[PDB]
Nucleic acid binder design. Structure first.
Lengths: 192, 1011, 288
DNA sequence: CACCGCTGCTAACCCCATACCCCGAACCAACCAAATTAGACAGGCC
DNA sequence: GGCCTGTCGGTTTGGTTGGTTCGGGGTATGGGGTTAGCAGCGGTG
């Protein structure tokens, strides 16, 4: 039930066709080379290819573009009365979703200093490995139970290191946020 | 745990490396936008932004071409003002990288950065010798370059380090105008008795402080005259709701403003231009208060989107200039300079030598602060559209009006298709209108520029310095061709304009005050029940099939509004003394700047005002007050002065009765032609006759002397036409010569011929040719041919003739104009010769693709602005408002040819009025001018008439037609190709009509020349 | 101008109109007039050019019956905001009074028939003028549902008959005339289309009357000012009522486009807005 | 005061990407076209 | 030169033209990155 999947797609251009046909051969002759290097050498092959040879791929692409014109026209004509409305809905949604995904990947790529670790986080980091349990969830519940059974004295080191990581996070946040001010991104600073 | 901690540290350092990698990776409309952007960024001190955009444009192949040496000079001057030597050097690197040649402004910026940074004498010397090898001039820098006082100070500090005895040219010795007619005005040889004001120095300083405060606030709050009372609950609730809504609009407007500034800011972070810095030019609170003011004052019917944009742009520019002067120290220098200037006007202060206000002002300094050039039109339009759209989008209100969950925009734009071209209209919500109506706000707000000044205006020292102290005011009103006329006003010699500047300064220095009684009565009628018979609008309660009733209602509402504003300002200025600065049109005619309240208004307006400084009547004061009274009544227009005085003596009882009981007595004044002015003159005459000594009564009422058909007077003077000189009272006579009666008779004979021929209009106009009809008609054809501003007025005067079929009023007005033209050209053949000569000459000049230009006998250059076919349009998401750029392609030959004679006559009458004003000022008389009317105190009416006639004879005594002919010949008969059109043009220009026999000197003995 | 000069076309037209009093516009040479007279029609010729009057009158003198020749330019009758000062321009009240034509109720049948050809360069102008007169119940339509048969150019014909099925030509005149009259093609002369326009008996309703048509015209021009925008966008600038609510009342979705609205959809829109009950005001119309 | 989401951890499993070129789509500055209608002189075209 | 025709902040919207940037099109297995489970809490509204 996806109109976009059945919509006629653009034909492959000349160069992209040459690469689409050459790639399997380069892969057969160099099974262990990384795809990066193979695509690079294929692009060099295309640059070295005489223009008279590229002309063939270009003509094929042009015919494929005519047949694509006919196909896309027929498909546009085939849809229900609100064909233009449905095309606008699907295109708009596609664009907004694409921009959103790009922004999410951007925000994920950034490198903000990790938040402070709590005493519970420290205890889990120190005792999880030796905690018995068949799975990470069961070992995490074990660490949780042993933590709930811990006394106030047994937790002093974890709480101390937790405070130290609070100060560390404070300083690193100061410096990092300053550098972000240098980059003109004062929106990422702490609100108050 | 050092394992995890060290892992975090290592990842942090790698992230730092990633951060290092990220750090590693012919004028035109668009050109005008960019340049205005940089120049604007210099004022907000956002140099990194402008430098960023400039670098981006320079780095792109297709964008580098769009940059200009002036822009690089802008950024460079910014860095020099900031002392960024490295960045300035970088900008210089861009300038050399893109070829082109650095200029005086470039080297001045460099010198500024070195002086501010105190560079070594080796680098300074090397810079001065590289400047010498480049051929640039040291003294041309301080003169040809526009720099602030801080730039000048820093450059001087840098120069005094190598050349301590380096001195700028000795200044500033001002030159005197040697014009033929102004020589005796500026020559020291002569006894001057310049008048002084009645207010003391400290008083003038207090008033100056009040005016300065008012202009700094940019707003004026005046109390509403009338209808304060209202139902107690309704006004209460409506006021509470309006206040809450205004707070909500204030907050929402602040938020929307900040969000918009952020949007534009990010748009500048992108490679696109935006008005960000312009929005950063004025305080956000001032912007919000301005928009809220415009919203409060928006007319219920709506306003043109484009017009609103223009208004917002104008107020933004004004408040920005005010802010710049406020923070640049120009305010204090203006306080000191003006406080010294007040010595010439103050009564208890003397000056070393007598001089005119402009002369003294320039003598004290004259730094004149700094001149700021306005923004390009596309920037003004885009800014207006931004502000308007932001206001509409931000202002919301509930629809429930009198449980208001739903929200609708307060402003909604609709479209008018009356014009074949749809026009955008901004209309307010009807519920909002009803809310403001029920609230009955008892306060009105005016722009500081729309109300009279509380102190003597600034003397006109140049085409860019005048009128209100801080707000910039154009020397010439005419918007069409403003670039041409302004640039020529600055091109002409500074001395050439001395006369006009001194005349406007004199007009502005006239002290005015309000007539308490007249205001009390006019309000009494307005406060209760209007009096349309006496020009007092009636409230909507008196509005009267449905279509006509609605029409009359709308007209009555318009008049009611205008009267509300005028009378409101009058009440605000009741107990204060105020001055009205004057301006000029492209023709030279002077007009008051404050439009709402000024002496150029209607009868009521003229009666509300009187001279603040008095003048003892003297031996003829009373006689002139009575004669003036009769003139205002219009009962003895044809009678001589002596019989007008005798008539005043006869109806003296009706004068006293009318003055004592205006609304309860015999109400004789209500029957006069000018009822309110007649009443005021009756009160003045009563105070004079009832005084212990009438000859010593300090009279404040101005007396008027008007030139009947001043234009025909000028034409009769040019051609020495005896028939004209007699018709228009140029030739002395004991009885007034009414040219309207003779022309009415001739036109009556023509109407007898055509009516004999069976024409319908000629048959219907039988018995309607009267002095007033032909007076306004001739007043039209002379001063106006086409452009039916006054012609509509004549249609009105005919519509007020009940016994006339209104179907022909239009055709009857056209026929009347044509017959007046023909008749005047028949009885005044010489006048027709001059008119045809000027009209034809203008036709030929315009036919060559050049507008008609000339120079008045006082050295004022006049240029006709009629051009056509310039247009360009922006598009804000989405109306597309058009704009008329200043680049003209071809002149409008028709308007030029039809307009040249009338405009020239306007320059002649304006020159005459100016000469009369100056020479009367030498004798200590108070002089103001309304169209053709000359006003003065009853004690000096005779003297004013003397100066009038003398200056008229002196004016027309010169070869105006000859000098004009030779002028047009030299200016327009110089094209080497083609020479044929220059030969026919010269052939027509050298065909100056031969003057008549009339002896101009007779004007000195003509009693009724001006009466 | 345009003149009927072919005898065959004159005969075909005569038989068509015969298919009552006939008002013939701009007969010119009088070929169609003579064809009608020979066919037995009672003809009143409104000739704008006086030079054609003699021969025409001659034809009348040949029949010497009830034919009547008047020097009148039909397209100049009752000038809007005019002083009534022209021979060719006249008053339909006076003309019909002289011709003995009496007004009949709107619901009554067609009292008279007018035939002619639109000006070669004034088709849009004539259509607008006639639209104003009809919706205002003025001019000829003051006497009833006058049947108007007129030759028109092919472009203005297609634009007039266009609708959402052919959006590129759909426009205000299309809506107005398709709602006002039942238009039918009577003949096509190569191309010129002889269109028959008969006012609909049910044009006026309780909420669409000769008293409020101006507001509807304002709405139409307003919407067609930006034909690509959505109907709700324009409505937000036309009424204080909930635009979404109104559009929903007329059974349209929020994404409904202007060009997708049928003439009856516009009519039901206007009548629906006028019908609104719980509002202090319904329209924002304030224009001279 | 309540509400978010990021750390502490794992897990195996799920999910996007550098080398490259070709040309169709698409975003600016500018000119132009449309909609609409009720008697003299000067300009434009032949 | 002679004859015929148009006329006494043109409005905003949008359609074509000359340019120039932007991205969708082809991909592979290898690497990352991912919801579930439980507690704690800095940061935000």
């Amino acid at each position: 039930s996806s109109v976009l999947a059945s919509s006629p797609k653009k034909p492959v251009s000349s160069y992209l066709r040459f690469s689409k046909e050459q790639l399997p051969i380069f892969k057969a002759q160099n099974p262990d080379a990384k795809t990066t290097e193979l695509i690079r050498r294929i692009a060099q092959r295309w640059r070295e290819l005489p223009d008279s040879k590229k002309k063939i791929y270009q003509d094929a692409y042009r015919a494929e573009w005519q047949v694509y014109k006919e196909e896309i026209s027929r498909f546009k004509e085939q849809l229900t009365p609100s064909q233009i409305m449905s095309l606008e809905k699907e295109i708009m949604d596609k664009h907004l979703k694409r921009k959103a995904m790009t922004k999410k990947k951007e925000l994920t790529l950034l490198g903000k200093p990790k938040r402070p670790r709590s005493a519970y986080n420290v205890y889990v980091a120190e005792r999880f490995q030796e905690a018995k349990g068949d799975s990470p969830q069961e070992k995490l519940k074990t660490v949780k139970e042993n933590w709930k059974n811990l006394s106030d004295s047994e937790k002093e080191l974890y709480i101390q290191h937790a405070k130290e990581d609070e100060t560390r996070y404070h300083n690193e946040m100061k410096s990092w946020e300053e550098q972000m001010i240098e980059v003109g991104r004062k929106d990422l600073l702490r609100r108050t | 745990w050092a394992k995890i901690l060290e892992k975090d540290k290592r990842t942090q350092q790698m992230r730092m490396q990633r951060l290092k990698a990220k750090l590693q990776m012919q004028l035109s409309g668009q050109q005008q936008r960019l340049l205005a952007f940089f120049k604007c960024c210099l004022l907000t001190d956002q140099l990194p932004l402008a430098h960023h955009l400039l670098v981006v444009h320079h780095g792109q192949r297709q964008k580098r071409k769009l940059l200009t040496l002036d822009m690089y000079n802008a950024v460079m001057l910014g860095w020099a003002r900031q002392g960024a030597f490295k960045e300035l050097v970088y900008v210089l690197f861009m300038v050399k990288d893109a070829g082109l040649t650095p200029d005086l402004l470039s080297y001045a910026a460099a010198l500024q950065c070195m002086g501010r940074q105190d560079q070594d004498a080796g680098t300074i010397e090397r810079c001065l010798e590289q400047m010498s090898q480049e051929g640039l001039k040291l003294q041309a820098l301080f003169t040809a370059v526009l720099l602030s006082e801080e730039d000048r100070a820093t450059v001087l500090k840098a120069v005094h380090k190598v050349k301590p005895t380096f001195s700028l040219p000795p200044q500033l010795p001002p030159p005197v105008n040697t014009s033929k007619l102004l020589r005796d005005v500026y020559a020291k040889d002569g006894r001057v008795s310049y008048p002084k004001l009645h207010l003391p120095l400290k008083t003038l300083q207090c008033l100056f402080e009040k005016q300065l405060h008012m202009e700094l606030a940019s707003r004026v709050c005046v109390v509403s005259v009338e209808k304060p009372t209202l139902p107690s609950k309704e006004v209460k609730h409506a006021r509470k709701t309006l206040k809450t809504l205004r707070d909500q609009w204030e907050k929402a407007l602040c938020r929307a403003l900040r969000e918009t500034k952020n949007r534009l800011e990010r748009e500048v972070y992108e490679g696109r231009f935006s008005l960000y810095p312009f929005l950063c030019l004025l305080d956000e609170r001032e912007v919000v208060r301005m928009l809220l003011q415009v919203l409060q004052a928006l007319p219920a019917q709506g306003e043109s989107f484009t017009t609103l944009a223009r208004e917002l742009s104008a107020r933004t520019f004004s408040r920005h200039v005010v802010q710049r002067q406020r923070v640049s120290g120009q305010v204090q220098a203006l306080q000191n300079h003006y406080r010294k200037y007040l010595c010439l006007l103050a009564s208890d202060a003397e000056v070393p030598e007598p001089c005119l206000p402009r002369q003294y002002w320039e003598a004290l300094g004259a730094p004149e602060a700094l001149r700021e050039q306005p923004w390009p039109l596309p920037v003004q339009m885009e800014l207006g559209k931004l502000l308007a759209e932001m206001l509409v989008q931000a202002t919301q209100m509930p629809c429930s009006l009198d449980r208001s969950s739903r929200l609708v925009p307060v402003l909604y734009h609709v479209y008018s298709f009356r014009n074949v071209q749809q026009i955008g209209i901004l209309k307010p919500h009807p519920a909002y209108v009803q809310l403001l109506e029920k609230a009955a706000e008892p306060t009105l707000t005016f722009e500081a520029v729309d109300v009279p000044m509380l102190c003597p205006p600034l003397p006109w020292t140049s085409p860019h310095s005048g009128a209100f102290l801080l707000s910039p005011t154009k020397l010439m009103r005419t918007v069409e061709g403003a670039t041409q006329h302004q640039e020529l006003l600055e091109t002409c010699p500074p001395t050439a304009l001395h006369g006009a500047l001194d005349a406007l300064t004199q007009l502005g220095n006239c002290a005015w005050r309000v007539n308490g009684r007249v205001l009390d009565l006019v309000l009494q009628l307005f406060q209760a029940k209007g009096c349309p018979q006496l020009g007092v609008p009636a409230p909507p309660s008196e509005a009267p099939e449905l279509a006509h009733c609605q029409k009359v209602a709308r007209e009555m509402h318009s008049l009611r509004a205008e009267a509300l504003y005028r009378l409101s300002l009058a009440q605000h200025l009741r107990d204060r003394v105020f001055w009205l600065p004057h301006n000029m049109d492209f023709r030279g005619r002077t007009y008051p700047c404050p439009p709402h309240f000024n002496h150029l208004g209607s009868d009521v307006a003229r009666a509300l005002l009187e001279f603040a400084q008095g003048r003892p009547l003297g031996p003829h004061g009373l006689d002139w007050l009575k004669i003036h009274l009769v003139n205002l009544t219009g009962l003895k227009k044809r009678e001589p002065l002596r019989k007008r005085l005798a008539f005043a003596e006869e109806v003296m009882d009706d004068i006293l009765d009318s003055a004592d009981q205006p609304l309860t007595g015999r109400k004789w004044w209500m029957g006069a032609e000018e009822p309110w002015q007649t009443l005021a003159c009756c009160m003045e005459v009563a105070n004079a006759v009832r005084a212990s000594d009438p000859a010593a009564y300090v009279s404040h009422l101005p007396v008027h002397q008007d030139g009947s058909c001043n234009g025909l007077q000028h034409y009769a003077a040019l051609g020495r036409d005896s028939v004209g000189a007699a018709s228009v009272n140029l030739e002395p006579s004991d009885v007034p010569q009414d040219v309207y009666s003779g022309v009415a008779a001739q036109v009556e004979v023509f109407r007898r011929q055509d009516a004999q021929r069976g024409m319908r209009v000629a048959q219907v106009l039988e018995g309607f040719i009267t002095r007033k009809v032909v007076k306004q008609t001739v007043m039209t054809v002379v001063y106006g041919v086409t452009r039916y501003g006054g012609r509509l007025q004549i249609e009105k005067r005919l519509r007020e003739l009940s016994d006339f079929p209104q179907e022909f009023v239009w055709e009857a007005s056209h026929y009347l104009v044509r017959q007046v033209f023909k008749s005047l050209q028949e009885m005044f053949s010489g006048t027709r010769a001059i008119q045809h000569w000027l009209t034809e000459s203008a036709r030929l000049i315009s036919h060559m693709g050049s507008v008609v230009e000339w120079v008045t006998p006082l050295g004022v250059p006049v240029i006709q602005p009629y051009r056509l076919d310039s247009k360009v349009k922006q598009i804000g998401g989405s109306i597309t408002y058009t704009h008329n750029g200043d680049i003209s392609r071809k002149p409008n030959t028709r308007k030029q040819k039809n307009g040249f004679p009338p405009n020239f006559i306007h320059s002649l009458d304006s020159s005459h009025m100016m000469l009369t004003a100056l020479h009367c000022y030498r004798k200590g008389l108070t002089f103001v001018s309304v169209h053709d009317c000359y006003w003065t105190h009853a004690a000096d009416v005779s003297v004013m008439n003397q100066v009038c006639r003398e200056q008229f004879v002196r004016l027309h005594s010169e070869p105006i037609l000859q000098d004009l002919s030779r002028f047009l010949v030299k200016r327009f008969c110089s094209e080497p190709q083609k020479i044929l059109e220059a030969s026919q043009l010269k052939e027509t220009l050298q065909a100056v009509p031969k003057p008549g026999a009339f002896d101009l000197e007779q004007v000195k003995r003509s009693t009724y020349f001006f009466s | 101008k345009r003149y009927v000069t072919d005898r065959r076309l004159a005969e075909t037209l005569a038989q068509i109109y015969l298919g009552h009093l006939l008002l013939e516009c701009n007969p010119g040479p009088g070929i169609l007039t003579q064809a009608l007279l020979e066919a037995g029609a009672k003809v009143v010729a409104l000739e704008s050019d006086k030079t054609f009057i003699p021969h025409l009158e001659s034809l009348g003198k040949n029949l010497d019956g009830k034919l009547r020749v008047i020097h009148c330019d039909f397209f100049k009758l009752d000038p809007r905001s005019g002083g009534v000062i022209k021979p060719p321009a006249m008053s339909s009240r006076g003309l019909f009074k002289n011709l003995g034509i009496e007004a009949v109720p709107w619901t009554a049948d067609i009292p008279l028939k007018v035939v002619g050809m639109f000006p070669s360069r004034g088709e849009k102008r004539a259509l607008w003028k006639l639209a104003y007169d009809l919706y205002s119940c003025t001019s000829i339509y003051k006497f009833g549902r006058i049947e108007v048969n007129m030759f028109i150019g092919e472009k203005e014909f297609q634009k007039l008959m266009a609708d959402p099925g052919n959006p590129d030509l759909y426009h205000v005149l299309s809506v107005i005339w398709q709602l006002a009259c039942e238009i039918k093609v009577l003949h096509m002369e190569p191309k010129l289309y002889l269109i028959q326009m008969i006012p609909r008996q049910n044009l006026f309703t309780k909420n669409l009357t000769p008293m409020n048509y101006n507001i509807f015209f304002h709405l139409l021009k307003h919407c067609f000012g930006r034909r690509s925008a959505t109907v709700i966008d324009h409505l937000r600038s036309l009424t204080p009522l909930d635009a979404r609510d109104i559009l929903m009342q007329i059974g349209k979705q929020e994404d409904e486009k202007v060009v997708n609205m049928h003439p009856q959809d516009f009519k039901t829109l206007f009548e629906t807005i006028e019908r609104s009950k719980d509002c202090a005001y319904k329209w924002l119309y304030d224009e001279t």
